[PDB]
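Forum: Protein Structure Q&A
Topic: Joint prediction for protein chains with partners

I've read a bunch of threads here and the consensus seems to be that you should model interacting components together rather than docking separate models afterwards. I'd like to see that in practice. Below is the full input, 1359 residues plus whatever partners are listed. Could one of the regulars post the assembled result?
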Amino acid sequence: EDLDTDNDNIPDAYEKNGYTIKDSIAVKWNDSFAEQGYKKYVSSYLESNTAGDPYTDYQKASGSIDKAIKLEARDPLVAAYPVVGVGMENLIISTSAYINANVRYYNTGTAPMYKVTPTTNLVLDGETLATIKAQDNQIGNNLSPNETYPKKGLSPLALNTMDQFNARLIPINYDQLKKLDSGKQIKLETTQVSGNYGTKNSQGQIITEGNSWSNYISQIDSVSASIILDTGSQTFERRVAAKEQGNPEDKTPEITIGEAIKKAFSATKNGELLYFNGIPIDESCVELIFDDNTSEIIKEQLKYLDDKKIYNVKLERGMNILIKVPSYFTNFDEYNNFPASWSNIDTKNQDGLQSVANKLSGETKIIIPMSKLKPYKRYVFSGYSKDPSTSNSITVNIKSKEQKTDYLVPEKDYTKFSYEFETTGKDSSDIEITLTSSGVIFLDNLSITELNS
Amino acid sequence: EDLDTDNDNIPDAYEKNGYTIKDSIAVKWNDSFAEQGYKKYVSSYLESNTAGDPYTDYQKASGSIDKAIKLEARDPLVAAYPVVGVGMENLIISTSAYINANVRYYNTGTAPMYKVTPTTNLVLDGETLATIKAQDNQIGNNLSPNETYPKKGLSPLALNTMDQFNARLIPINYDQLKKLDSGKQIKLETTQVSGNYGTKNSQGQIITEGNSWSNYISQIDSVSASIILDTGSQTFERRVAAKEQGNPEDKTPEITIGEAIKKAFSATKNGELLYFNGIPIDESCVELIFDDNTSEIIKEQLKYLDDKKIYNVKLERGMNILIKVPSYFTNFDEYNNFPASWSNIDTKNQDGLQSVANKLSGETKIIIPMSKLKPYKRYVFSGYSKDPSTSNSITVNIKSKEQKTDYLVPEKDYTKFSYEFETTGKDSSDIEITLTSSGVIFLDNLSITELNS
Amino acid sequence: EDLDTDNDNIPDAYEKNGYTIKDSIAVKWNDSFAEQGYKKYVSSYLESNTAGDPYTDYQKASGSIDKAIKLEARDPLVAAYPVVGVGMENLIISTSAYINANVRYYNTGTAPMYKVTPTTNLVLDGETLATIKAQDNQIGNNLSPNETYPKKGLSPLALNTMDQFNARLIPINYDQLKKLDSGKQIKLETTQVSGNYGTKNSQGQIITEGNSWSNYISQIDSVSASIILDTGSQTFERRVAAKEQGNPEDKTPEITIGEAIKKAFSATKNGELLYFNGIPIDESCVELIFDDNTSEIIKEQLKYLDDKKIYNVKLERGMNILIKVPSYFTNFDEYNNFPASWSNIDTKNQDGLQSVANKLSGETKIIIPMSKLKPYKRYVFSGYSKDPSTSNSITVNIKSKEQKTDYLVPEKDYTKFSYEFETTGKDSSDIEITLTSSGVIFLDNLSITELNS
Ligand SMILES: [Ca+2]
Ligand SMILES: [Ca+2]
Ligand SMILES: [Ca+2]
Ligand SMILES: [Ca+2]
Ligand SMILES: [Ca+2]
Ligand SMILES: [Ca+2]
Ligand SMILES: [Ca+2]
Ligand SMILES: [Ca+2]
Ligand SMILES: [Ca+2]
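Posted by a regular:
Agreed with the consensus. Here's the joint model:
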């Protein structure tokens, strides 16, 4: 109808159901609008800023905001939130002594952040040497998403001043140098970052002076769940709005984990498979990492669902989700990046997850060279196994810093198994993997994924 | 009706009685609204800000305030009040000499506090070495309730500057080092903290510039009673509005201590039992600590009440209440965390406080290992005893720094007994507890609670 | 009609089709208006600022903006965007030691930029010595396009102060001088530049105080493609607005690469040939340099087009295009700047690209003196070859740092061939070029172009 409780130019009936923006006006969603390229939006009819960002639902949906904001933040359920961190490129120490850093700022959010003023800590071993706020020489005027300051091809900015105006960074005593010579080196971490956001005033100009991102950080972090996606080299962090559990007046729409991922990362869905930029981010092709609360919530909710899939679990406020695209992934259909081919593989099957499976009759042993491996790193080998007989056990031998010999009992249906090991030393013993089964098994989606060192 | 004396969008009749917020409008409370999850609110019809905070009754009730504010502060009788303290994580001294601290700020209130600027004192023994206000490098942009700055996983921020811009902390003379070498160490206490609160302006943005928390601290502290709850590791401080005694024009609603606790901490009530987060905070399961004025007020009011319970005493302005969840608690029904089982215990009874009691025929002696004990600490052993005969006396022997031998005369009904002792030295004599009675007694709710060292 | 969705004084029908400004009002475009000197403008009817600059479509089209802005930015599809860089004219080092620079700012954009405050890095070899922001003494009040500060005839401005107020630039230790004496010299690069833009207020005056160019840099860079033109001595950088691919609500007009170049550089078109300032910038007379993404996009789009020309490819958002006017260019019609004439050239032909071709029967060898050559530089020799027989192969011998002997198979129609070599040392061996073919070939548009050293 024409009822607007929160006065954001979108009718309450349109917000409760689907709606789309055409010619800068909101209209009812129709299933025939998807082939033209339109997207269906849903938002709370009792709140103008469903996601908690400075931009209302209408501004996000109609694209009436800064054009450097990523389109993923045009969804009213996805918050435009800059994530900025400081990377320490180089360290210089020279005479007490003086210390200097070459650093570069990174942005992994959905919104640009003007006037970047990071605050950093200098910690050697537990003890924090100094806390430094960015001075006038170390302030970035612009920082667009998926971009750095200084940009690519430019040297990292210098940091040598402790306080305002002119100052020199200096350890308090010779003990710092004494423990530096022993073999202890210095970290750098970011405690907070200050910056501005852009709005259009009554004169049509863009102002970024009185608009502070710190006025919305606590609000966004309290009404949303965090989803992080790592692709080995690039990382993307997103916040998705979720409804309150015990609040009856909370009208935030409810979406699942897969729907939230698709909304936050704008991943193309080809019927059922989900692709980010041609890289499959489907549930069975990636590693999912959760904290204790999210893990227990998902385990509790899974038993009440017949499908029993992570992507079908309703998103809830306070969730932290990490997605790790496997470094090595083979499915015997369209991708096999392993430098060395597997042993005793039969592709003549039709019982696989997507197209076919691997009919293993005996054992499979793989020799992985360490040239394409990262030393001093923890890895996880994951896979999907199928055994209708449920009478054969699989024993696995993994070569690592400590030799691992483990046993597994496959189930009737496809079951995921993951084994964690650690590799230390580049010029060390070669990594060997072996798995032997009593009879004939089905294997699919074998992955090697890096974890924290 | 439609009479609004204070002009806060809530009718006076609705405020005097119960009311609830539905579709952003206030409506009469109905007993059938509780099963939908709604809450009943009451507030003064002669004051827009009943609790004394910057947010009016309508804004609190309808949730038109900053979303990082805890839901306990959505009650008009509970004030959104940040409680911020500075914890001194590490101390570094090195050459006169120079001193540096690694500190972290903590928030235990219901509202976020922006631009945290604490003021701290450096006291060694009585004499205050220096008073330091937080500089630009030591200011926290955001500080959400139940969160720290820097957040978990980040090193504590450094403090080495005395005055504005650039300065070095330094003792005035060698006497400081002379008495430091003797074995005297340095404390750190917070005298005041400066910060901002968030409000939405006419343009829909959030501004935290001219909004100071110091404009409301004295007002809140003068029209409210303080309730603190300690759970061994976490502490929560709340302020609950109370009416003036001699003022006839004060229309603040009157609530009891149990109702105030439930409102302030959002504790679930399962008929009669009260739980915070699964931890029972019922009157008989926790330790209640009061100052002299509150103690005498409660003792005076108890004699005029037939029920004779602390939680049924009307809350009054100026009250200070402390709740300490017992470290060890046994009730013989659903909880027994004592590492060593009790002696001569008979659970076959039906005269207990909730389900059953302990039928002790003789004596009970418990040997508590000091591995799960805190040395150099004062402890209290509390319990509930019942003796219909009223002819048997109970003598208790408690091993501590000084051996305690005390006598008790149980009453006809259940009576609470508390004994205070001190344990000194980790590698000291083991703690022994014994209590002997002439005949058969009923024992329930035995608790061991830590006190100040 | 009279429908204005974005309220920029231009009807939507006029924006969708062509329109022109007459007597400060927008009117329908007519084909008879071109002979009077009028230009046809197109812009999005759903956005007031199609290009993303602080000036709306009407202000750009009608010339209601600062008069120092170049007329190329009067097109609503071309953004008024200043490009400012710092050129290091001289370096002085003298005693640790002190360092001073003589520098001059350059502007290669379409808009003037007031209050220029560049930020620069001092890098010797990887390590960044210091980052310096322009102080009060090094700020340029005005910087017009194609102009410098200080202007021509004035000495470059001095830079010797590191921080605010008064400071002296100084290396941290003697290691800087130690590696300077070895033969390592210092670069200077610009990380960012701050400045203002001019707008007219309600009183008719021009204000450049609160108008910051950093509020529009990220917006312009995200909705436009960059085109750079280098003419050996002068460089011009432009941004041309392009539409979003997947957005159905993006109404930005679509133009080709040649049309975009003509719009951005105001190049006169004499039917088909395109001239910048009498220098032909036609597709076959210049070198086109693309990044990987633009190269693959253009290759993909070319196969779907019958004409198969770069200038007919539709411009797309995110494109980076570089145009290099060849240093030496001969076409046997109206231009031959080679100091030494070619060998075995027959101009009696009528099958050339524009007027005639070169009928080569045998081989062509050219001796190019190094007096008009730049030592330690990489060069490219390009040309167009035609062979209807398609039975003769052409072998080329190029003298350089390494002697190059390459083979080529000409096609039936005109085909472009490019060969890259490097010349090192002014007092080195003379450069020789030779190319021999089995039979009779057609040669046209022979060019020598400088590349990066
Ligand atoms: Ca609405
Ligand atoms: Ca809404
Ligand atoms: Ca498969
Ligand atoms: Ca009222
Ligand atoms: Ca009121
Ligand atoms: Ca009991
Ligand atoms: Ca228009
Ligand atoms: Ca327009
Ligand atoms: Ca020609």
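The two ends of chain C are 57 Å apart (CA to CA).
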